[PDB]
Design a protein around this nucleic acid. Structure first.
Ligand SMILES: [K+]
Ligand SMILES: [K+]
Ligand SMILES: [K+]
Ligand SMILES: [K+]
Ligand SMILES: [K+]
Ligand SMILES: [K+]
Ligand SMILES: [K+]
Ligand SMILES: [K+]
Ligand SMILES: [K+]
Ligand SMILES: [K+]
Ligand SMILES: [K+]
Ligand SMILES: [K+]
Ligand SMILES: [K+]
Ligand SMILES: [K+]
Ligand SMILES: [K+]
Ligand SMILES: [K+]
Ligand SMILES: [K+]
Ligand SMILES: [K+]
Ligand SMILES: [K+]
Ligand SMILES: [Mg+2]
Ligand SMILES: [Mg+2]
Ligand SMILES: [Mg+2]
Ligand SMILES: [Mg+2]
Ligand SMILES: [Mg+2]
Ligand SMILES: [Mg+2]
Ligand SMILES: [Mg+2]
Ligand SMILES: [Mg+2]
Ligand SMILES: [Mg+2]
Ligand SMILES: [Mg+2]
Ligand SMILES: [Mg+2]
Ligand SMILES: [Mg+2]
Ligand SMILES: [Mg+2]
Ligand SMILES: [Mg+2]
Ligand SMILES: [Mg+2]
Ligand SMILES: [Mg+2]
Ligand SMILES: [Mg+2]
Ligand SMILES: [Mg+2]
Ligand SMILES: [Mg+2]
Ligand SMILES: [Mg+2]
Ligand SMILES: [Mg+2]
Ligand SMILES: [Mg+2]
Ligand SMILES: [Mg+2]
Ligand SMILES: [Mg+2]
Ligand SMILES: [Mg+2]
Ligand SMILES: [Mg+2]
Ligand SMILES: [Mg+2]
Ligand SMILES: [Mg+2]
Ligand SMILES: [Mg+2]
Ligand SMILES: [Mg+2]
Ligand SMILES: [Mg+2]
Ligand SMILES: [Mg+2]
Ligand SMILES: [Mg+2]
Ligand SMILES: [Mg+2]
Ligand SMILES: [Mg+2]
Ligand SMILES: [Mg+2]
Ligand SMILES: [Mg+2]
Ligand SMILES: [Mg+2]
Ligand SMILES: [Mg+2]
Ligand SMILES: [Mg+2]
Ligand SMILES: [Mg+2]
Ligand SMILES: [Mg+2]
Ligand SMILES: [Mg+2]
Ligand SMILES: [Mg+2]
Ligand SMILES: [Mg+2]
Ligand SMILES: [Mg+2]
Ligand SMILES: [Mg+2]
Ligand SMILES: [Mg+2]
Ligand SMILES: [Mg+2]
Ligand SMILES: [Mg+2]
Ligand SMILES: [Mg+2]
Ligand SMILES: [Mg+2]
Ligand SMILES: [Mg+2]
Ligand SMILES: [Mg+2]
Ligand SMILES: [Mg+2]
Ligand SMILES: [Mg+2]
Ligand SMILES: [Mg+2]
Ligand SMILES: [Mg+2]
Ligand SMILES: [Mg+2]
Ligand SMILES: [Mg+2]
Ligand SMILES: [Mg+2]
Ligand SMILES: [Mg+2]
Ligand SMILES: [Mg+2]
Ligand SMILES: [Mg+2]
Ligand SMILES: [Mg+2]
Ligand SMILES: [Mg+2]
Ligand SMILES: [Mg+2]
Ligand SMILES: [Mg+2]
Ligand SMILES: [Mg+2]
Ligand SMILES: [Mg+2]
Ligand SMILES: [Mg+2]
Ligand SMILES: [Mg+2]
Ligand SMILES: [Mg+2]
Ligand SMILES: [Mg+2]
Ligand SMILES: [Mg+2]
Ligand SMILES: [Mg+2]
Ligand SMILES: [Mg+2]
Ligand SMILES: [Mg+2]
Ligand SMILES: [Mg+2]
Ligand SMILES: [Mg+2]
Ligand SMILES: [Mg+2]
Ligand SMILES: [Mg+2]
Ligand SMILES: [Mg+2]
Ligand SMILES: [Mg+2]
Ligand SMILES: [Mg+2]
Ligand SMILES: [Mg+2]
Lengths: 150, 38, 99, 246, 113
RNA sequence: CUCGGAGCAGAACCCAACCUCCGAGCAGUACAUGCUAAGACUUCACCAGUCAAAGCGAACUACUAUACUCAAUUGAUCCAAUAACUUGACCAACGGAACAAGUUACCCUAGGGAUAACAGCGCAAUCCUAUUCUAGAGUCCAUAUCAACAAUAGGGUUUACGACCUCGAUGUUGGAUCAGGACAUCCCGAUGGUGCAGCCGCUAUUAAAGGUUCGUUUGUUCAACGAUUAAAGUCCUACGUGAUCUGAGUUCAGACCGGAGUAAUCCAGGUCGGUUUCUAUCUACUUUCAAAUUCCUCCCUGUACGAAAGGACAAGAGAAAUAAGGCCUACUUCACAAAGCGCCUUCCCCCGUAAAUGAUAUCAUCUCAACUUAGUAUUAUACCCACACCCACCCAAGAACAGGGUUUGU
RNA sequence: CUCUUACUUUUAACCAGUGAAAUUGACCUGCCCGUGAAGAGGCGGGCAUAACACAGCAAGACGAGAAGACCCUAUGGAGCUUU
RNA sequence: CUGAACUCCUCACACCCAAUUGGACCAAUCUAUCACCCUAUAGAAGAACUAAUGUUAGUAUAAGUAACAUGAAAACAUUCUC
RNA sequence: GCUAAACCUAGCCCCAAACCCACUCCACCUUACUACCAGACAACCUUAGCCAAACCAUUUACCCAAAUAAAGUAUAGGCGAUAGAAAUUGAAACCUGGCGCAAUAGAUAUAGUACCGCAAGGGAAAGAUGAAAAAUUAUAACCAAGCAUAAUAUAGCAAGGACUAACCCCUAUACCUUCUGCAUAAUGAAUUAACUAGAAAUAACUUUGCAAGGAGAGCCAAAGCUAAGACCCCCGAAACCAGACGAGCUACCUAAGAACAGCUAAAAGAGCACACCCGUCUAUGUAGCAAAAUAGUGGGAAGAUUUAUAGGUAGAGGCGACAAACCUACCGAGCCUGGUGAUAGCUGGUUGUCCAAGAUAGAAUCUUAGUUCAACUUUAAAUUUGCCCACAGAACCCUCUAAAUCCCCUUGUAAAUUUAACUGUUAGUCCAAAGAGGAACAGCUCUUUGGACACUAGGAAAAAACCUUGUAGAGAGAGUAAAAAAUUUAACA
């Protein structure tokens, strides 16, 4: 629940997209197994998909490591320093493709409750409301029931 | 429940109560009260 | 279960808040809430209550203009209702048609 | 399991109980539908269609006498002596298309079935087998492994003696002199000419019939078959020979 | 305390009445209606059972009509009534009929001798 | 307790109550009420039950002739009898166990708030109150007072009805203790009417601050009786209140008497006897700081009133009781002290009506007319009110803590 | 008993040592009226309301205790009696 | 004007009835063969516990509560009180 | 940071194979474990009952000598429940293994010991270093409840929405079981850990094999047959019967013992009154000192008295100055073990995730707290109408000449019937309407038509039954539905 978990405000990394868009995904580390049914879908992803995926994303360094493992995993690292580990155990090639593409599109900020679905640093152009905004002024700034020149 | 004929005035179902309210006699009102004319 | 059902109340409460805030802003200009919302619709201004509440806080000059526009349309309604059809439609009462 | 009661606790009454109302299966009066069912003789039907089918496929050989052993060995019929089966009954189904000439030994035969085989030049005989004899003749090899002398075939029960002593049924105990008249009668009734089987090349085979006390062709009661050594042992004692020949 | 003095009166409904309504197709033998007293009378091709049940004598369509009622001269009770009627007055009753649907048969060519 | 007809259930079918009515447990005539077989109906299942063309055999050319009249007029399986055919239960608890009654308070187990007794709740026949009507009663007179036949309301104290919470427990009468509340008021206050002279009464309006006794028999609440009182009110509060008490009654196990029963044992019967636990966790509460009610006596006065008899009100004075709050001089229990049986103090108000002036309505009219008096208190004032000597000691202060004193710390 | 009072001992309360039991869904555990499976600390409308011990009290928590012993039900038992 | 989980709007959709019934998945364990930082496909079974005044064990609450104990002085010799 | 947590062995289970079985000296059937004396007593004899038959009374499977098959056949039986052959047929058989348990498991077992009972009998708990303890200042840490480090600040099922912010604001009547309906002041639950509850035939269905045949003799077969997969819980009575064990308590009896001051009377089932026995009344106590006591007050106290010792009567019984007393703290008939996992139509309990369909006319019944059949409901399969309905049509007798129904093409719709296989539901509530009973009372009772509820949300104040509204997610959009209570009074000639 919201009260049982942390929250944050909607934000970006270094004002991304303002002057130019910079992909936040910086590194991908695959750990596949030469033998093992759990990694069957991950092995097929490395044969036809990983090479074409790297061509599109030249700013992401992909590290494929083939070693004995019972649970194949992809570890995504982002420019802001976030590290995310996602198991690809027994996933199909299409499933892995979808997951890897999602990681490429994310900023790396915590996937937690966002308080507001918007953010702005300049919420007011005409002046933020205050109690005197719509109050008229009086001659000599006299207060209610105030004797002047006594 | 109570029988269709009772010694007291039986409470009506609310929908019937509304029906009665909406179908009350409305007398014809003259534009000018007749006592205000010759 | 509470967290699940609270999603309904969040939307309900959010809208009660906007109406309260819009009512406050309208009263500062001598307008009641129903007059503003009703008459803005008659001007084909489809601004929702969320935006209207935000405008009241952060765009008070625009909101006074919206209040003025609603007030103008409201007065045109009265003149039309008072008239017997002789009068042409009010300048702000004309509706843009879409075919 | 539901809620409470006997359904959930597992204690509902026996099957057939109706809550105390006199149950259906009891309130119906008793009647002897099945009285003596276990003492009723049964006969596996063998149709002329099935017999013709077996002959066409080479499963039964019409060049030699056909009895229960040959029918069972060809998997033409399945006999269950423990289920009160007394043999095969030859049924008329397929008579119109039956063309084979056969010498067949059965336990029962319909009049029309007899005519179908005799019109084609064949011979049909009705032969009784008691429950022990029927078991032996159907599965000879299991019997030979018991090391018992071949038993004599018992005579029919008194109620069946009229059937098997009548030439109309081609009884094996009927007077051979009465067969010519019976064979001619069927030929007249069903509009065919009785063939003279005495002129046939297979006449000797057509006449081959086992003695009424003989279970197998060529084997006499009281012979011990030695399958391991492929020999036959014959008793020579006078008393034993009298028992097995009577 | 006290007890009720009315006993009996627990007979179940007889399930009597019309089984085949107007326009329904009936085969011969089908019961058209069951009744305790004569409410519907047997018309054309409609038999009446010992218990007054009406049944179809022919295959066809059931029809209900109103017809003039002339009793048998031997039916003393009915004849006693009609004789006491004012002249010009005719009794009517409801009758049910079966309109036969099929012909009794057809002549077919069987040989060319 | 099974079966049929009618109403409920008005018109296809169907349809319940310890609902309203009437019936059945046969009889008569046949002796083809012989055989056989399409298609259907069906008592909400099954079982059972019902109707039938054609055909065979009869009858037949007079018989509303062919499955008899009649509404129900009835009983499964097993089994028994019988050569066969066929027959056999008020098996009426009528879908029928082949054949078995009482009693338990000496009782037991499993359950039920699906179901009673106590209480609550529902309802208001019954019960209580008010008003409407104006017969009658009241010497006349309907309305001082009482009140028939009826009518319209309210109350929720009785006896009942219902069975909605509780039977892995909501302890059952009366009393003791302490009482909270309603006013439909028993006494005290203020008023209108009277068949109110006065004294006593009757009746209605207003008033719930205060008060509302002790005894004999009875377990009694009641009731009767004795003696009083200004009066000995009516009700609600789980018929207030047993984690405060009592246990005479009711209502276990023992026993006697009358009665019932063959007995066991039992009866709204009477009678003698019979174990009433709880160490308080939570809520609530533990100095509403403080205005008082009533009777009697004298006096007014033997006055007002009255034929007489009889016999007040208001003010004035005194003395008591009760209640609340204190105190120890004496008395008494007692003795550095606590106590009552002793003594001391105790203060405002009640709104129902009765009268002027005066409009609507040019009189009049106390006025949900404007208004004026009887006629009103911000209920009054009273009490309480300072504070780092405080280790220790003392104390009229106190469970602890706190509080007062130590200028009484060898 | 009217009508209670005083004193002693015990208990009591405080200090020191030792140290149980029934009970306990969770509890951040107010009052009034109303409501509701028909008698509310928990619902609706109001009012009240810093926090925390110790000592009392027994109106409530339909307080604890004993799967009601009264009553009814079960084709559940047992004792006793008998035409 | 306000006012639903009704309806519309952006995206998605198997994703709100007791008893009962149909279906799709699955934790851990063992076995076969794989796998080799904890797995796969199958075959098996003592195969899943917020509740039975459940059984056993631990520790709470009531509670530091109820309750319990040692006559006096002294040189610890002795004496005194009862 | 404490308390604790964690471990892998001890052994055990089920099979196979194999027949089995003691011994130092001394003691041991008397009061066993007691060196040493006159006796002579001697073993066998049908199980019953629970239970099933929904009661119960005849009856109700229990290795009895070869697996299989014949066969659940012949046959038996309140011919009910159920019981049940034989002739005949006829195979294999190499102990040293394990899809068994691993300290709440597996034997109860570290042991039939401790402890409990007079006895028969019942019957536990638990251990954990390392190669070395002749390395003991050695093996780090991290994990239940309970606590400590570190008490507390208005307000409330303790959370959710949130928020700059713990709280303050707004929304929200624990769970389970049981019911017509439970926040209920109905049931269970202090909490943690471990343990603790669905076993299978008949058919059918699905997927292979082969196919007029199938199957590794039996059996079935008018597309069948063979094989496989997939459906049937736990705890609890009072009881009944059999065989043992008990009279050291108590009831009564037998043998042989003991006690009873003083005073009066002197004769005593006499009086007063100690020891002693009993237990009338009150208070205290009520998890107590005590599973029947204490304090006082009482009855008897030379007798039908009280009392020590040994012995006898035993549960279909004993014993009883009958209280249905007492027979080892619980006797309307003891206790122990066994039959026994007795039985329970009765209460309680019944363990991972997700989706889907799903609410109910009646009949019979020693039956109305239950069942079986219908009805409804669910899955699969087949092929063809189902629902809505136009005219025409369906009774006289009789007082309500009722709202309606039945039948039904068209049309709008997509269901319906049949086949196959089953379960659960058969203890019902309010509202509107037509009636019956009661009192034209009941939140009353009984039928009928419809609705709602037992399922969601909004409204009527809180609110099962009234109104609005249904098909499921996200949204910091929008239009709506139902939805607020009105009223104020008497002059008169
Ligand atoms: K038969
Ligand atoms: K009966
Ligand atoms: K009533
Ligand atoms: K109760
Ligand atoms: K008395
Ligand atoms: K509390
Ligand atoms: K006036
Ligand atoms: K005193
Ligand atoms: K209390
Ligand atoms: K053990
Ligand atoms: K429960
Ligand atoms: K309640
Ligand atoms: K309840
Ligand atoms: K209870
Ligand atoms: K003895
Ligand atoms: K004691
Ligand atoms: K229960
Ligand atoms: K039952
Ligand atoms: K509404
Ligand atoms: Mg009605
Ligand atoms: Mg249950
Ligand atoms: Mg039930
Ligand atoms: Mg009737
Ligand atoms: Mg009926
Ligand atoms: Mg039927
Ligand atoms: Mg005929
Ligand atoms: Mg019956
Ligand atoms: Mg019947
Ligand atoms: Mg009987
Ligand atoms: Mg008695
Ligand atoms: Mg009981
Ligand atoms: Mg009830
Ligand atoms: Mg009552
Ligand atoms: Mg109550
Ligand atoms: Mg009333
Ligand atoms: Mg008069
Ligand atoms: Mg009352
Ligand atoms: Mg009822
Ligand atoms: Mg309880
Ligand atoms: Mg009082
Ligand atoms: Mg009054
Ligand atoms: Mg009371
Ligand atoms: Mg008490
Ligand atoms: Mg009490
Ligand atoms: Mg008493
Ligand atoms: Mg007597
Ligand atoms: Mg008494
Ligand atoms: Mg005076
Ligand atoms: Mg005047
Ligand atoms: Mg005037
Ligand atoms: Mg104390
Ligand atoms: Mg202490
Ligand atoms: Mg409890
Ligand atoms: Mg209340
Ligand atoms: Mg306290
Ligand atoms: Mg106390
Ligand atoms: Mg509570
Ligand atoms: Mg209690
Ligand atoms: Mg009980
Ligand atoms: Mg029994
Ligand atoms: Mg909205
Ligand atoms: Mg929707
Ligand atoms: Mg959807
Ligand atoms: Mg997995
Ligand atoms: Mg697996
Ligand atoms: Mg398990
Ligand atoms: Mg657990
Ligand atoms: Mg448990
Ligand atoms: Mg305490
Ligand atoms: Mg103490
Ligand atoms: Mg002491
Ligand atoms: Mg039985
Ligand atoms: Mg019985
Ligand atoms: Mg044999
Ligand atoms: Mg063990
Ligand atoms: Mg912990
Ligand atoms: Mg709140
Ligand atoms: Mg559960
Ligand atoms: Mg109930
Ligand atoms: Mg509720
Ligand atoms: Mg509860
Ligand atoms: Mg209960
Ligand atoms: Mg199974
Ligand atoms: Mg018995
Ligand atoms: Mg016995
Ligand atoms: Mg003795
Ligand atoms: Mg003696
Ligand atoms: Mg003496
Ligand atoms: Mg004496
Ligand atoms: Mg004496
Ligand atoms: Mg006595
Ligand atoms: Mg003694
Ligand atoms: Mg004695
Ligand atoms: Mg006696
Ligand atoms: Mg007695
Ligand atoms: Mg005992
Ligand atoms: Mg036993
Ligand atoms: Mg059981
Ligand atoms: Mg669904
Ligand atoms: Mg019967
Ligand atoms: Mg029933
Ligand atoms: Mg229809
Ligand atoms: Mg149609
Ligand atoms: Mg039913
Ligand atoms: Mg009702």
């Amino acid at each position: 629940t919201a009260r049982g978990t942390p929250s944050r405000f909607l934000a970006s990394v270094l004002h991304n997209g303002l002057g130019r868009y910079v992909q936040q995904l910086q590194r991908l580390s695959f750990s596949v197994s030469r033998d093992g049914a759990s990694s069957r879908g991950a092995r097929e992803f490395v044969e036809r998909e990983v090479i074409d995926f790297a061509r599109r994303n030249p700013g992401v360094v992909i590290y494929v490591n083939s070693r004995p493992c019972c649970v194949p995993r992809v570890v995504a690292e982002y420019l802001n320093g976030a590290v995310r580990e996602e198991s690809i155990h027994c996933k199909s090639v299409e499933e892995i493709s979808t997951l890897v593409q999602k990681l490429a599109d994310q900023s790396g900020l915590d996937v937690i409750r966002i308080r507001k679905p918007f953010h702005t640093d300049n919420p007011s152009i005409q002046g933020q409301w205050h109690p005197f905004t719509n109050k008229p002024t009086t001659f000599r700034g006299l207060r209610p029931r105030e004797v002047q020149d006594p | 429940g109570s029988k269709a004929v009772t010694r007291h005035r039986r409470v009506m179902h609310f929908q019937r109560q509304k029906l009665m309210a909406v179908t009350e006699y409305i007398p014809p009102k003259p534009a000018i009260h007749p006592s205000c004319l010759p | 279960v509470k967290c699940t059902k609270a999603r309904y109340l969040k939307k309900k409460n959010m809208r009660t808040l906007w109406i309260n805030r819009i009512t406050a802003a309208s009263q500062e200009h001598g307008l009641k809430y129903p007059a503003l919302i009703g008459n803005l619709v008659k001007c084909q201004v489809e601004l929702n209550r969320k935006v209207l509440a935000d405008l009241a806080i952060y765009e008070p000059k625009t909101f006074k203009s919206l209040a003025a526009l609603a007030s103008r349309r409201r007065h045109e309604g009265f003149a039309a209702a008072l008239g017997d059809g002789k009068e042409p439609e009010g300048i702000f009462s004309r509706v843009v048609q879409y075919h | 399991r539901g809620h409470k009661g006997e359904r959930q606790r597992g204690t509902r009454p026996r099957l057939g109980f109706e809550g105390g109302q006199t149950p259906f299966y009891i309130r119906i009066p008793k009647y002897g539908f099945n009285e003596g069912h276990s003492f009723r003789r049964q006969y596996k039907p063998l149709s002329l269609n099935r017999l013709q089918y077996l002959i066409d496929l080479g499963r039964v050989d019409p060049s030699q006498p056909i009895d229960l052993t040959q029918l069972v060995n060809g998997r033409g019929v399945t006999i269950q002596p423990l289920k009160r089966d007394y043999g095969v009954q030859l049924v008329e189904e397929g008579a119109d298309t039956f063309t084979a000439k056969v010498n067949i030994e059965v336990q029962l035969a319909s009049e029309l079935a007899i005519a179908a085989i005799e019109k084609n030049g064949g011979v049909v005989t009705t032969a009784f087998y008691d429950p022990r004899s029927l078991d032996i003749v159907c599965k000879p090899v299991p019997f030979f492994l018991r090391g018992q002398p071949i038993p004599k075939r018992m005579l029919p029960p008194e109620e069946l003696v009229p059937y098997y002593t009548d030439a109309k049924n081609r009884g094996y105990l009927a007077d051979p002199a009465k067969f010519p008249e019976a064979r001619l009668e069927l030929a007249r009734k069903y509009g065919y000419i009785l063939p003279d089987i005495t002129k046939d090349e297979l006449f000797k085979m057509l006449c081959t019939r086992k003695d009424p006390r003989q279970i197998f062709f060529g084997l006499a009661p009281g012979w011990v078959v030695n399958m391991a050594d492929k020999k036959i042992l014959k008793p020579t004692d006078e008393n034993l020979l009298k028992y097995y020949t009577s | 305390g006290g007890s009720s003095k009315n006993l009996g009166g627990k007979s179940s409904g007889r399930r009597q009445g019309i089984k085949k309504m107007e326009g329904h197709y009936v085969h011969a033998g089908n019961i058209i209606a069951t009744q305790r007293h004569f409410r519907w009378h047997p018309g054309a091709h409609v038999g009446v059972g010992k218990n007054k049940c009406l049944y179809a004598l022919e295959e066809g369509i059931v029809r209900y009509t109103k017809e003039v009622y002339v009793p048998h001269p031997r039916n003393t009770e009915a004849v006693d009534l009609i004789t006491r009627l004012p002249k010009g007055a005719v009794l009517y009753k409801t009758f049910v009929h079966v309109v036969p649907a099929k012909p009794e048969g057809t002549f077919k060519l069987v040989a060319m001798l």
